[PDB]
């Protein structure tokens, strides 16, 4: 968990601007989240540079910020960032788009909280680095040591079962080997998990928990934020599924009881 940032290019501060480039800029820490609302490629892929002319190159967010998770219009920045990283997302605010959303925004009759020139909107994100590796398992074959238990490091994963221990308040997770049609078991992990060999609603064990997951595949890591109070010890499981038997792994988590302060 961290601060939630937002870049909403549907707002008039962008639409009715005079400039041909309008800017939204974010200074983010690891485990922050960013929501990007564009009225017209990211977060799954992002731009390396702000200038259109040079460094037109783009990169997968997992290659740039390994350990990060994309779900919908939101990015959960990896709990571990190795290097200060800038990246950029662009929004084409053409005159048709602007006219459309100026009409859409008329639905707002007042400024209650929610509980013309063509432009190029730019979201500039700056991500600070940190030192702590992610408490969890990496089942992908690589030497990136972003997680405390990579399969590369001997003794970390035995018999294809990675045993992690989590205390109250801690963030833990795992990352399946990358592929375009891998799945997790149970499908809705962490909201459902394996407990005592049966599928179990995690809310019935550790209510108050939080999770960061992509629900469409096992492309991205799975994260669990253990609540500040855990009444008793629980051992739960999630599993990486794949037609490839080399990518079949078990994430086993020993959740300890307590009250953190
Ligand atoms: Cl998505
Ligand atoms: Cl999702
Ligand atoms: Zn999604
Ligand atoms: Zn009102
Ligand atoms: Zn709390």
Cα of 242 from ligand 5 centre, angstroms: 35
The experimental method is: X-ray
- Distance from the CA of 103 to the center of ligand 4, in angstroms? 19
State the DSSP code for 135. Answer: E
Q: Which ligand is nearest to the CA of 222?
A: 2
Q: What does the block give as tokens for 210? A: 């939080």
What separation in Å is there between the alpha carbon of 108 and the centre of ligand 4? 9
Which residues make beta-bridge pairs with 23? Answer: 122
Angle at 31 between CA 150 and CA 67, to 5 degrees: 30
Ligand number nearest CA of 44 is 1
- 177: which DSSP letter? P
Report residue 19: phi and psi, to 5°.
Answer: -60, 160
Q: 52 with 58: CB under 8 angstroms?
A: no
For residue 206, the CA-to-ligand 5 centroid distance in Å is 12
Name the region of 169 (left: φ>0; alpha: ψ -120 to 50; beta: rest). left
| CATH 2.60.40.2860 is right for the domain spanning 133-261 | yes
Taking the CA of 73 as reference, the closest ligand is: 1
Q: Show the beta-strand stretches assigned E in 48-197.
A: 58-60, 69-71, 74-76, 85-93, 119-127, 134-138, 147-150, 161-166, 171-175, 183-185, 192-195
Structure tokens at 80: 């571990």
CA of 217 to the centre of ligand 2 (A): 9
Contacts of 63 (CB under 8 A, 6+ apart): none
The token duo for 30 is: 């690891």
Contacts for 14 with CB less than 8 Å, ≥ 6 apart: 22, 24, 93, 119, 121
- 87: nearest Cα among 38, 26, 133: 26
Q: How far is the CA of 208 from the centre of ligand 5 (A)?
A: 8
**C-alpha–C-alpha distance, residues 240 and 218, integer Å:** 8
**C-beta separation of 242 from 229 below 8 A:** no
Ligand nearest to the CA of 114: 4
Ligand nearest to the CA of 213: 2
21-45 burial, b at 16+ Cβ within 10 Å, e below that, comes to ebebebebebbbbbebebbeebbeb
From the CA of 259, how far away is ligand 5's center (Å)?
Answer: 10
Q: Would the CA dihedral through 58, 71, 191, 169 be positive or negative?
A: positive
Q: How far is the CA of 117 from the centre of ligand 3 (A)?
A: 33
Asked if residue 186 has a cis previous peptide bond (ω within 30° of 0), the answer is yes
94, 101 Cβ separation under 8 angstroms: no
Could you tell me the distance, in angstroms and rounded to a whole number, from the CA of residue 107 to the centre of ligand 4?
Answer: 12
- How much distance in Å is there from the Cα of 113 to the middle of ligand 4? 9
């Amino acid at each position: 968990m961290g601060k939630s940032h937002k870049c909403d290019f549907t707002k008039e501060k962008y639409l009715l601007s005079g400039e041909k480039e309008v800017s939204c800029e974010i200074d983010a820490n690891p485990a922050d989240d960013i929501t990007f609302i564009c009225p017209n490629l990211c977060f799954h892929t992002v731009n390396i540079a702000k200038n259109i002319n040079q460094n037109k190159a783009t990169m997968s967010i997992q290659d740039l910020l390994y350990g990060s998770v994309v779900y919908g219009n939101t990015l959960f920045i990896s709990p571990y960032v190795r290097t200060n990283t800038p990246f950029y997302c662009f929004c084409n605010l053409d005159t048709v788009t602007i006219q459309k959303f100026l009409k859409i925004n008329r639905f707002l009759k007042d400024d209650d909280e929610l509980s013309i020139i063509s432009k190029r909107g730019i979201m500039s994100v700056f991500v600070r680095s940190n030192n702590n590796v992610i408490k969890g398992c990496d089942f992908g074959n690589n030497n990136k040591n972003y997680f405390s238990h990579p399969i590369s490091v001997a003794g970390k994963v035995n018999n294809k079962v990675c045993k992690i221990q989590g205390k109250p308040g801690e963030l833990v997770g795992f990352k399946c080997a990358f592929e375009e049609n891998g799945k997790v078991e149970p499908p809705n992990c962490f909201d459902q998990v394996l407990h005592k060999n049966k599928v179990t609603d995690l809310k019935t064990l550790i209510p108050g928990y939080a999770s960061y997951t992509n629900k469409h595949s096992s492309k991205y890591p799975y994260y669990l934020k253990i609540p500040h109070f855990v009444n008793e010890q629980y051992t739960i499981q999630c599993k990486c599924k794949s037609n490839n038997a080399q990518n079949e792994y078990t994430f086993e988590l020993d959740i300890q009881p307590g009250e953190s302060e």
